Amino acid sequence: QTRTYDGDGYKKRAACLCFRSESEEEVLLVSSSRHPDRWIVPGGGMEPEEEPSVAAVREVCEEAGVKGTLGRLVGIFENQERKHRTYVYVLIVTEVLEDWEDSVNIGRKREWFKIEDAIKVLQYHKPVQASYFET
Ligand SMILES: O=P(O)(O)O[C@H]1[C@H](OP(=O)(O)O)[C@@H](OP(=O)(O)O)[C@H](OP(=O)(O)O)[C@@H](OP(=O)(O)O)[C@H]1OP(=O)(O)O
Numbered sequence: 001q002t003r004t005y006d007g008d009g010y011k012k013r014a015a016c017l018c019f020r021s022e023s024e025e026e027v028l029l030v031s032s033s034r035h036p037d038r039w040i041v042p043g044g045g046m047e048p049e050e051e052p053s054v055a056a057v058r059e060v061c062e063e064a065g066v067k068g069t070l071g072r073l074v075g076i077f078e079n080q081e082r083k084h085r086t087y088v089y090v091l092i093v094t095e096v097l098e099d100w101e102d103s104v105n106i107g108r109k110r111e112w113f114k115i116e117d118a119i120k121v122l123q124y125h126k127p128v129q130a131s132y133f134e135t
């Protein structure tokens, strides 16, 4: 896929907080491709002309193998150190698929976390993703 950028050179990305239910108590994290012992929030680059909510849902299907009801935009988060600008949405998961693109292609893993444990495992390498949950 083609990477895209805002006018300031930051990479355009989208991500979703995939909750198990409307109570937003458990969220789905996926393993990192290059470092499978780490967890990240599923998301990725926006394609050219792609709306951010479309990108977010597409990346969650690809990386995490779930579909659901797209909810609110939480916010737009910059990672200054890596020059990323990410739109973060809530998704309420209603469909969990068994054999999804990144599982088959690269052995990506997925796992449910209580919110405070997701924050904990994201903090060391992904502190901006941990901040996605602050509100
Ligand atoms: O190839 P790069 O320019 O170095 O960008 C990489 C790449 O991001 P994109 O391919 O989506 O642009 C990694 O994703 P993969 O290709 O391995 O799946 C991503 O790593 P993770 O998504 O697993 O975290 C990493 O991002 P990060 O450093 O935030 O972990 C990000 O590197 P940059 O930080 O340079 O964009």
Ligand SMILES: [Cl-]
Pocket (backbone or CB within 6 Å): 019, 020, 021, 022, 023, 024, 025, 026, 027
């Ligand atoms: Cl939940």
